[PDB]
Amino acid sequence: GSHSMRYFFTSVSRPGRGEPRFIAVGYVDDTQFVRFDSDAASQRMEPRAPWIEQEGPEYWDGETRKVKAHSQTHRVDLGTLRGYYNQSEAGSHTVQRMYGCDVGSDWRFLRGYHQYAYDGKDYIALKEDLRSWTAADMAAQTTKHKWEAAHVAEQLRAYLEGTCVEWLRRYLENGKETLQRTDAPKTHMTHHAVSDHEATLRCWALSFYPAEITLTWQRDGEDQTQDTELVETRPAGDGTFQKWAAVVVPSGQEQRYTCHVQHEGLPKPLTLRWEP
Amino acid sequence: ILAKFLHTL
Amino acid sequence: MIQRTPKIQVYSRHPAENGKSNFLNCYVSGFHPSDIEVDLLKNGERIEKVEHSDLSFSKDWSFYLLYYTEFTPTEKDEYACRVNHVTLSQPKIVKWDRDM
């Protein structure tokens, strides 16, 4: 399957005093591998996976230097965006950036990403061709003019199609025994009597990686969305994920219902039925 | 690894 | 000035059995802005050995966080997650239901 590398950057201005709070996280697929937080003591890019620990102290020097230049760029942005939107200094405000590359199952360049939001709303994003920009409003149109002038898109394209892709490959190779493994979900079904005539079947997917999954209920071979409830897929806290889906059914009719589970780690889709 | 430069808006 | 109220799930990392060491999680998502207060509670009282994940966010720019602490469930103990956020009138409390 495909793989992604992504970085996520959040900066929250502190109006009373001092510079903005800045947090950066790096991910390979659904696995966080690095981070920086401006309010931590180390003031360094820190490892969050055991496999990135094998990088030498130059790597940590280079990634610390870069991530600090990143927080300064976002510090300067908060102040430009305050003026652009003509906002006061009493208000806290937030910028978020995300960038990265996706590779297919041959690990070649598939797709690149660089997006930027202000106060939780789109501001500017690199289009999927990587040579032009989507600006959401006129302030962002001003930024787009400046970045066209200074050939920014083209630097990004070198990074997204080149550096990002080569470092992704290298991580997949050094985190191999976790990143290139896929953990199929451990599934089961529970029953709970609502009342004397209604019953609830809940289908569980536990312990799976990566996070993408689908759970579908059927009745007598047909999709059923009515009288069901999905939960958002949630992290277990040990690198794996969970999710469940449930359906309310009339008592005695449990065996009409089947739960179907699809996941990259399951050669074929799985089918659960209450009746043992 | 991170991008080498990040331009101000 | 666009505010999103956090969703909350409270759950264990493993199938919950009594006298067996585990992890109580409170996963908070879909909120903006990022400032948020999350506490785990044990029979109402706040637990202090509580760690949490590094702030990140979804493709709609809403934030999410995992708060967790080690615990061993027992027959009588009741657990809960307590969230406050500019968005809420006062704290939303969600009980740990084991089958969820």
Contact assignment for C25 to A237 by CB distance below 8 Å = yes
Q: Are A121 and A137 in contact (CB under 8 A)?
A: no
Residue of A25, A114, A194 to mutate for C, most C C-beta atoms under 10 A: A25
For chain B, say whether A27 makes contact (Cβ under 8 Å).
no
Say whether the B–C interface has 3 or more Cβ pairs within 8 Å.
no
Q: How far apart are CA A176 and CA A254, in angstroms?
A: 42
Pair of tokens at residue A39: 């309010």
Contact assignment for B1 to A99 by CB distance below 8 Å = no
For chain B, say whether A76 makes contact (Cβ under 8 Å).
yes
Q: Coil, strand or helix: which one is A138?
A: helix
For chain C, say whether A8 makes contact (Cβ under 8 Å).
yes
For chain B, say whether A159 makes contact (Cβ under 8 Å).
yes
CB nearest to A237's CB, from C1, C68, C100: C68
Question: What structural domains and CATH numbers belong to chain C?
Answer: 1-100 (2.60.40.10)
Q: How far apart are CA A113 and CA A127, in angstroms?
A: 8
> What is the b/e burial string over C26-53, where b = at least 16 CB atoms within 10 angstroms of the residue's CB?
bbbbbbbbbebebbbbeeeeeeeeeeeb
Q: What resolution in angstrom units was achieved for this structure?
A: 2.3
10 Å Cβ neighbour count for A76?
Answer: 13
Q: How far apart are CA A13 and CA A38, in angstroms?
A: 12
Residue A116, φ and ψ in degrees, nearest 5 = -145, 125
Sheet hosting strand A3-12, strand order edge to edge = A46-47, A31-37, A21-28, A3-12, A94-103, A109-118, A121-126, A133-135
Spatial CB neighbours of C51, under 8 Å, sequence gap ≥ 6: C67, C68, C69
Q: What is the 3-state secondary structure (H, E, C) of A30-81?
A: CEEEEEEECCCCCCCCEECCHHHHHCCHHHHHHHHHHHHHHHHHHHHHHHHH
Task: Determine the distance from the C-alpha atom of residue A223 to the mean position of all C-alpha atoms in its chain, rounded to a whole number.
Answer: 29
- The beta strand positions in A59-169, using DSSP E, are 94-103, 109-118, 121-126, 133-135
Place of tokens 């059923």: A224
Contact assignment for A35 to C32 by CB distance below 8 Å = no
Method for structure elucidation: X-ray
How big is chain C by its Cα radius of gyration, in Å?
14
Question: What structural domains and CATH numbers belong to chain A?
Answer: 1-181 (3.30.500.10), 182-270 (2.60.40.10)
Q: How far apart are CA A95 and CA A139, in angstroms?
A: 14
Q: Are A171 and A5 in contact (CB under 8 A)?
A: yes
Facing residues of A199 across strands? A193, A249
Q: How far apart are CA C55 and CA C34, in angstroms?
A: 8
Write the DSSP assignment of chain C as a string of letters: ---BPPEEEEEESS---TT--EEEEEEEEEEBSS--EEEEEETTEEPS--EEPPPEE-TTS-EEEEEEEEE---SS--EEEEEE-TTSSSPEEEE--TT-
For chain C, say whether A232 makes contact (Cβ under 8 Å).
yes
CB nearest to A25's CB, from C1, C56, C68: C56
Contact assignment for A159 to B8 by CB distance below 8 Å = no
CB nearest to A94's CB, from C4, C7, C34: C34
For residue C27, the chain A residue with the least C-alpha distance is: A234
Q: How far apart are CA A164 and CA A98, in angstroms?
A: 13
- Estimate the crossing angle of helix A138-149 against helix A57-84, to 10 degrees: 130
**Residue A174: enclosing H or E segment and its boundaries?**
helix A164-174
Q: How far apart are CA A195 and CA A266, in angstroms?
A: 36
Q: Are C8 and C59 in contact (CB under 8 A)?
A: no
Q: Check residue A197 and report its DSSP letter.
A: S
Q: Check residue A159 and report its DSSP letter.
A: I
For chain B, say whether A77 makes contact (Cβ under 8 Å).
yes
Cis peptide preceding C73, ω within 30 of 0: no
Q: How close does chain A come to B2, measured CA to CA in Å?
A: 7
Write the DSSP assignment of A222-262 as a string of letters: EEE-TTEEE---EE-SSS-EEEEEEEEEETT-GGGEEEEEE
Contacts of A265-271 spanning 24+ positions with Cβ under 8 A: A265/A182, A265/A183, A265/A184, A265/A185, A265/A208, A265/A209, A266/A184, A266/A185, A270/A187
Pair of tokens at residue C83: 């969230």
